[PDB]
Design a protein around this ligand. Structure first.
Ligand SMILES: CCCCCCCC/C=C\CCCCCCCC(=O)O[C@H](COC(=O)CCCCCCCCCCCCCCC)COP(=O)(O)OCCN
Ligand SMILES: N[C@@H](CC(=O)O)C(=O)O
Length: 401
């Protein structure tokens, strides 16, 4: 076709980066000349199509890949990896949100759920209904249950049941391997989408990011970088794995999660960098699709610093906010959020409705609107630390096995 084949000749991460750079440059130039409605009605629909594709991909890829993932064995490896991976994700997410409580105290703010039905909603009251209407967490539950039942059926004695279980597992594996090819097809289109998205985001609200609300995003970025270098480095340093080689060996997945702003949009490159890391296929194949959508350390560290930006601009106080329930509801919102770009803001609204200062006041929508505008640049570092937390967990359970 001509220049199209040269466009599918470049490597991907030497192209999404040039899209981000030439999006931020043209966004700043068109923000210095006041073309904000021009970008918002001409260039932003490409980024909205990109976000539409990354939302489309998440629901088959969290079901079929997770059913295939729960086919190592039923008892031993699955049980031990399950317990020592969910408690690992819980401690990493809780340490991230208590770092967020630690943050915005050395840093500054910017001036200018019935508590058991949330856990009972994990069990889906209808599996196809909880697969249609979003609901990533009950889809995860039903997918793990179906995987365990399929790996029980494959060890049966009747030949017809064995053939039927093998055919069902091969069908779901065909869907889970077709969704990765659709991910590759989307991430070929990705530089146009990230160009449009960062162009609009730098144009509309990002023109004054460094003037005011610079200390909140400085708090987010310094907290995420210190989260990396003070949790993941020490967790690789406990179990005897050199972590600078871990960054230089997983920088592929780190960078594509940094630019595409989706944890579940970087699942194939995270799987290929685990195999290029050589973790082992049977030991990552369950915990990477689980960890892609059950632990988000970026949103966990992000909800605390967002609630401290809102509550310390014009809010009640910090100890009247009762930070322990902020930690708990932020861990729950990190667990229950999806892997799309603009996901954690809605769960942040859920956190604020659940802990205090709900979204009805005339001085809470004005603080939330600025962070809804600036959410798109924080999503980058959020998904970056999420995918490298997944990779860190896979390397840890590679060590203790
Ligand atoms: C209007 C909506 C446009 C969105 C269409 C783009 C992607 C949606 C899914 C398209 C089919 C996905 C599966 C086909 C596919 O993967 O081929 C991929 C083709 O990729 C593309 O579709 C090119 C992207 C089209 C964007 C148009 C502008 C180009 C710049 C290449 O695969 P690979 O990773 O290089 O490895 C070789 C084996 N595939
Ligand atoms: N972008 C995050 C969610 C968020 O921070 O809004 C994810 O893909 O999981």
């Amino acid at each position: 076709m001509g220049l199209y084949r040269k466009y599918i000749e470049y490597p991907v991460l030497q192209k999404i980066l040039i899209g981000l750079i030439l999006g931020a440059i043209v966004g700043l130039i068109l923000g210095h000349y006041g073309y904000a409605h021009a970008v918002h009605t001409y260039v932003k629909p490409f980024g909205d199509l990109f976000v539409r594709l990354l939302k489309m991909l998440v629901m088959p890829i969290v079901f079929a890949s997770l059913v295939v993932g729960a086919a190592s064995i039923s008892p031993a490896r699955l049980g031990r990896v399950g317990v020592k991976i969910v408690v690992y994700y819980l401690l990493t997410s809780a340490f991230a949100v208590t770092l967020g409580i630690i943050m915005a105290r050395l840093f500054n703010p910017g001036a200018g759920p019935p508590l058991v039905h949330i856990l009972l909603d994990i069990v889906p009251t209808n599996p196809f209904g909880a697969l249609a209407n979003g609901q990533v967490l009950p889809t995860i539950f039903f997918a793990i249950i179906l995987g365990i039942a399929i790996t029980y059926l494959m060890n049966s004695e009747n030949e017809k049941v064995r053939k039927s279980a093998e055919t069902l597992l091969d069908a779901i594996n065909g869907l889970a391997e077709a969704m990765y090819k659709i991910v590759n097809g989307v991430m070929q289109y990705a530089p146009i989408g990230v160009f449009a998205l960062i162009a609009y985001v730098m144009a509309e609200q990002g023109v004054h990011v460094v003037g005011e609300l610079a200390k909140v995003t400085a708090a987010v970025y310094v907290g995420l970088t210190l989260q990396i270098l003070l949790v993941y480095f020490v967790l690789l340093k406990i179990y005897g794995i050199d972590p600078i080689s871990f960054i230089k060996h997983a920088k592929d997945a780190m960078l594509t999660a940094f630019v595409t702003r989706s944890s579940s949009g970087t699942l194939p490159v995270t799987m290929r960098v685990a195999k290029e890391m050589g973790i082992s296929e049977g030991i990552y194949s369950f915990t990477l699709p689980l960890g892609a959508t059950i632990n988000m350390d970026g949103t966990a560290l992000y909800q605390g610093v967002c609630t401290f930006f809102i509550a310390n601009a014009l809010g009640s106080h910090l100890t009247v906010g009762q930070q322990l329930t902020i930690v708990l509801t932020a861990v729950l919102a990190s667990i229950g959020t999806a892997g799309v770009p603009g996901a954690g803001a809605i769960m942040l609204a859920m956190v604020l409705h659940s802990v205090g200062l709900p979204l009805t006041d005339p001085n809470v929508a004005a603080a939330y609107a600025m962070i809804l505008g600036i959410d798109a640049i924080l999503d980058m570092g959020r998904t970056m630390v999420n995918v490298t937390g997944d990779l860190t967990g896979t390397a840890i359970v590679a060590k203790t096995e």
